Design an enzyme around this catalytic site. Structure first.
Site, PDB file in Angstrom:
ATOM      1  N   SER A  90     -10.654  -1.060 -11.903  1.00  0.00           N
ATOM      2  CA  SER A  90     -10.121  -1.797 -12.907  1.00  0.00           C
ATOM      3  C   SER A  90      -9.232  -0.645 -14.113  1.00  0.00           C
ATOM      4  O   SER A  90      -8.273  -1.404 -15.001  1.00  0.00           O
ATOM      5  CB  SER A  90     -11.445  -2.644 -14.111  1.00  0.00           C
ATOM      6  OG  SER A  90     -11.735  -3.444 -13.170  1.00  0.00           O
TER       7      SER A  90
ATOM      8  N   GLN B 268     -13.242 -13.122 -10.718  1.00  0.00           N
ATOM      9  CA  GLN B 268     -12.377 -12.772  -9.162  1.00  0.00           C
ATOM     10  C   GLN B 268     -12.254 -13.961  -8.932  1.00  0.00           C
ATOM     11  O   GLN B 268     -12.700 -15.262  -9.247  1.00  0.00           O
ATOM     12  CB  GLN B 268     -13.663 -12.759  -8.447  1.00  0.00           C
ATOM     13  CG  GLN B 268     -15.403 -11.919  -9.062  1.00  0.00           C
ATOM     14  CD  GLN B 268     -16.391 -11.807  -8.217  1.00  0.00           C
ATOM     15  OE1 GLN B 268     -16.713 -12.920  -7.583  1.00  0.00           O
ATOM     16  NE2 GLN B 268     -16.944 -10.764  -7.777  1.00  0.00           N
TER      17      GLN B 268
ATOM     18  N   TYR C  39     -13.387 -11.263 -19.695  1.00  0.00           N
ATOM     19  CA  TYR C  39     -12.982  -9.997 -18.624  1.00  0.00           C
ATOM     20  C   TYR C  39     -12.819 -11.114 -17.366  1.00  0.00           C
ATOM     21  O   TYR C  39     -13.487 -11.496 -17.297  1.00  0.00           O
ATOM     22  CB  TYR C  39     -14.030  -9.134 -18.876  1.00  0.00           C
ATOM     23  CG  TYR C  39     -12.904  -7.852 -18.112  1.00  0.00           C
ATOM     24  CD1 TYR C  39     -13.563  -7.317 -16.614  1.00  0.00           C
ATOM     25  CD2 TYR C  39     -12.234  -6.885 -17.973  1.00  0.00           C
ATOM     26  CE1 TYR C  39     -13.032  -6.656 -16.128  1.00  0.00           C
ATOM     27  CE2 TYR C  39     -11.843  -6.024 -17.659  1.00  0.00           C
ATOM     28  CZ  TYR C  39     -12.720  -5.989 -16.596  1.00  0.00           C
ATOM     29  OH  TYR C  39     -11.549  -4.601 -15.775  1.00  0.00           O
TER      30      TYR C  39
ATOM     31  N   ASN D 148     -10.274 -11.165 -13.025  1.00  0.00           N
ATOM     32  CA  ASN D 148      -9.322 -10.371 -12.596  1.00  0.00           C
ATOM     33  C   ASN D 148      -8.850 -11.579 -12.298  1.00  0.00           C
ATOM     34  O   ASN D 148      -7.130 -10.964 -12.141  1.00  0.00           O
ATOM     35  CB  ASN D 148      -9.847  -9.698 -11.336  1.00  0.00           C
ATOM     36  CG  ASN D 148     -11.087  -8.210 -11.532  1.00  0.00           C
ATOM     37  OD1 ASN D 148     -10.459  -8.072 -12.594  1.00  0.00           O
ATOM     38  ND2 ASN D 148     -12.053  -7.937 -10.470  1.00  0.00           N
TER      39      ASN D 148
ATOM     40  N   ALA E  35     -14.318   0.356 -11.505  1.00  0.00           N
ATOM     41  CA  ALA E  35     -15.408   0.339 -10.445  1.00  0.00           C
ATOM     42  C   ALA E  35     -14.590   0.118  -9.797  1.00  0.00           C
ATOM     43  O   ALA E  35     -14.169  -1.561 -10.250  1.00  0.00           O
ATOM     44  CB  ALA E  35     -16.941  -0.079 -10.974  1.00  0.00           C
TER      45      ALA E  35
ATOM     46  N   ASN F  62     -20.277   4.190  -7.916  1.00  0.00           N
ATOM     47  CA  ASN F  62     -20.219   3.413  -8.986  1.00  0.00           C
ATOM     48  C   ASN F  62     -21.436   3.752  -9.549  1.00  0.00           C
ATOM     49  O   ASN F  62     -22.828   3.500  -9.380  1.00  0.00           O
ATOM     50  CB  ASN F  62     -20.469   1.690  -8.895  1.00  0.00           C
ATOM     51  CG  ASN F  62     -20.115   1.312  -9.724  1.00  0.00           C
ATOM     52  OD1 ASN F  62     -19.224   1.425 -10.837  1.00  0.00           O
ATOM     53  ND2 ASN F  62     -20.405  -0.232  -9.377  1.00  0.00           N
TER      54      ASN F  62
HETATM   55  C1  LIG Z   1     -22.868  -9.203 -14.426  1.00  0.00           C
HETATM   56  C2  LIG Z   1     -21.080  -8.862 -14.278  1.00  0.00           C
HETATM   57  O1  LIG Z   1     -20.875  -9.383 -13.545  1.00  0.00           O
HETATM   58  C3  LIG Z   1     -19.813  -8.179 -15.214  1.00  0.00           C
HETATM   59  C4  LIG Z   1     -18.702  -8.058 -14.572  1.00  0.00           C
HETATM   60  C5  LIG Z   1     -17.290  -7.395 -14.689  1.00  0.00           C
HETATM   61  C6  LIG Z   1     -17.677  -7.292 -15.970  1.00  0.00           C
HETATM   62  N1  LIG Z   1     -17.243  -6.468 -17.333  1.00  0.00           N
HETATM   63  C7  LIG Z   1     -16.132  -6.862 -18.805  1.00  0.00           C
HETATM   64  C8  LIG Z   1     -15.457  -6.353 -18.546  1.00  0.00           C
HETATM   65  C9  LIG Z   1     -15.446  -6.134 -20.161  1.00  0.00           C
HETATM   66  O2  LIG Z   1     -16.478  -6.705 -21.504  1.00  0.00           O
HETATM   67  O3  LIG Z   1     -14.777  -5.023 -20.730  1.00  0.00           O
HETATM   68  C10 LIG Z   1     -15.584  -5.555 -18.303  1.00  0.00           C
HETATM   69  C11 LIG Z   1     -16.767  -5.302 -16.506  1.00  0.00           C
HETATM   70  O4  LIG Z   1     -16.586  -4.394 -15.810  1.00  0.00           O
HETATM   71  C12 LIG Z   1     -19.270  -7.415 -16.665  1.00  0.00           C
HETATM   72  C13 LIG Z   1     -19.986  -7.705 -16.459  1.00  0.00           C
END
Ligand SMILES: CC(=O)c1ccc(N2C[C@@H](C(=O)O)CC2=O)cc1
Length: 358
Positions: A61, A117, A147, A149, A315, A340
């Site tokens: 990211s 995603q 957040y 993608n 990550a 990670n």
């Molecule tokens: C639990 C899960 O799938 C998950 C996915 C993405 C995130 N986020 C949210 C983003 C953020 O809040 O800054 C960065 C990040 O990796 C957090 C948890």
């Protein structure tokens, strides 16, 4: 290197590598504008290849910072406006829910709950259109940050449309080349394979899988040297000769939304310096949870604030990365690892190092 830097880096990172069982790591510290490099362990365990200054890591990211700057460059070139409706650049997005969703919303995760995603089942451009047409927002645009993608990914794809260039082509010619990031890639070329570190997940060697809008969101691979150069460019944009790129960097570091102590930029995220690191380590901004947070619009956006902690975490399945810098102090850090590991550990180490040097 200055002994203070040598000492704080080794004393912070060495136990981190132990605690987290990280196979290989590269760190750069930018101090008074000049970079200093440190490496540990292995890029490839099976082949006993050490991590070097030329080792390629998956940024995950952290790639979004490049997307933000490329978008900023497009604004500076007069090709797009962040205030423009998404539908201006994708006329076939006719579904009602897209009324009022702007490029700004896509760039800053505030479109109204786009998912994390793009589904792995999306393979064609027709598939991608259906996905976005069929998505149903949870919230009105510009009210909550979640957040995603799929959000900034679409921003990246649309931002380059007026140029006629592919996302890769545009990133290479307008960002990588001018900044002399000659070992930074969206697709790792065969010439660079030997330098490409393996990621490690549950003891297995892995590389990131291809996906729709992967380049725009989590697709960049880079060396520690190139990432140091990237930090230098972001610390001092006025030293950059290409005027639209200089402006792009400044736009990416502008403050568009606020949640608590955090400010959302384009890719980059910011907090006022001096920072209480509690929120970014233990609290609401520690990145552990996928969190839907109400935001307060910054109308208009504050221009890049010199006294800021500017950062991004990243990550992939097999890699973890972190970048932070403080423009006022000419100070920055890049941490690249081929495992990670939790974000709070990464931020704790970066804070320890930078706070000692500030
Ligand atoms: C639990 C899960 O799938 C998950 C996915 C993405 C995130 N986020 C949210 C983003 C953020 O809040 O800054 C960065 C990040 O990796 C957090 C948890």
């Amino acid at each position: 290197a200055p002994q203070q830097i040598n000492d704080i880096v080794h004393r912070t990172i060495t136990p981190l590598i132990e605690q987290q069982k990280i196979p290989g790591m590269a760190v750069a510290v930018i101090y008074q504008g000049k970079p200093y490099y440190f490496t540990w362990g292995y890029a490839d365990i099976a082949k006993k290849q050490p991590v070097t200054q030329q080792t390629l890591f998956e940024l995950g990211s952290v790639s979004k910072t490049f997307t933000g700057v490329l978008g900023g460059d497009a604004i500076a070139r007069g090709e797009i406006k962040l205030s423009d409706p998404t539908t201006k650049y994708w006329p076939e997005l006719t579904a009602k829910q897209w009324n009022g969703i702007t490029l700004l919303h896509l760039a800053t995760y505030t479109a109204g709950g786009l998912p994390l995603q793009v589904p792995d089942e999306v393979k064609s451009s027709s598939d991608l259109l259906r996905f976005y047409q069929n998505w149903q927002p949870a919230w009105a645009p510009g009210t909550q940050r979640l957040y995603a993608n799929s959000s900034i990914g679409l921003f990246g794809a649309l931002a380059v449309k007026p140029s006629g260039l592919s996302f890769e082509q545009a990133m290479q010619t307008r960002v990588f080349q001018p900044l002399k990031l000659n070992h930074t890639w969206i697709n790792v070329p065969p010439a660079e394979e030997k330098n490409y570190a393996w990621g490690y997940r549950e003891g297995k060697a892995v590389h990131v899988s291809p996906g729709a809008l992967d380049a725009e969101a989590y697709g960049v691979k880079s060396t520690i040297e190139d990432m140091a150069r990237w930090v230098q460019s972001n610390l001092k944009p006025l030293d950059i000769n290409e005027k639209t790129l200089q402006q792009g960097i400044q736009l990416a570091q502008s403050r568009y939304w606020q949640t608590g102590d955090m400010y959302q930029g384009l890719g980059w995220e910011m907090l006022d310096w001096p920072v209480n690191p509690d929120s970014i380590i233990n609290g609401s901004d520690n990145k552990i949870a996928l969190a839907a947070r109400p935001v307060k619009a910054i109308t208009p956006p504050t221009p890049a604030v010199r006294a800021s902690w500017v950062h991004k975490t990243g990550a992939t399945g097999g890699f973890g990365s972190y970048v932070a810098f403080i423009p006022e102090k000419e100070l920055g850090i890049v941490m690249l690892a081929n495992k990670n590991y939790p974000n709070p550990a990464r931020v704790d180490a970066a804070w320890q190092i930078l706070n000692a040097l500030q």
